[PDB]
Amino acid sequence: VTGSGKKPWRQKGTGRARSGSIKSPIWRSGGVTFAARPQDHSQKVNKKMYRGALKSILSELVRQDRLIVVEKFSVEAPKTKLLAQKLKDMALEDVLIITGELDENLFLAARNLHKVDVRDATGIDPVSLIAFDKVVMTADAVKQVEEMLA
Amino acid sequence: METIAKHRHARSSAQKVRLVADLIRGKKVSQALDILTYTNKKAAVLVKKVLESAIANAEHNDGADIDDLKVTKIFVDEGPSMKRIMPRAKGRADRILKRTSHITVVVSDR
């Protein structure tokens, strides 16, 4: 705190309580006895618990009839108008369109859809596979997740 | 009939005005202007002008007949004091309080 170190008054004889610096945390405008610093909240998982817990949430998505397997599933023109009718037709309000080969055709056609996130099969993460209402997968994407999760 | 009239920030303090208000509280106006006139205090001179304003707003914003016009309600409640520094002996400092007050006279016919 931008201040001094000179004691504000005498130690003895003044009627006021002892005080030694104006920067003390009991005073106004000078303070924070345990001030926090920038830190790293990033905590470590074992590798097998991450891969295993992805296997467990794939299990939960399967037994609830939420995880959807299709074959090769992409859009034709880079237009979100196509994905509106297309995900109207399958009755897919909020999805995780996760494929194994990403392109400029499909990913651009979902960059402005809210409830749609189209990932690469390398990049699935355990908050998305729960945080979407359905998940739809390429057979190639299942082919890769079978390998990676192992 | 309500017809209030008040004087905010009366620069004589409330304990000294409130002595004068304890004379006219509950009388007719015709008694009140004279009893305030012959009272030898300053806040009589400060509250006779408030009650005189209450007369005029009663005759001029609503019904007249000053003859039947009681002072039903009058209350002085204190206002924001004003903080001034007083130098004293041996280097210490005091804080004198130029206190102000709010006079309110509510004159009515019934």
Partner: peptide, 14 residues
């Protein structure tokens, strides 16, 4: 107050 004076000395007792 900026200046607080030294207190009036005690009755001896020594």
């Amino acid at each position: 107050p900026v200046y607080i004076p030294r207190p009036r000395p005690p009755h001896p007792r020594l």
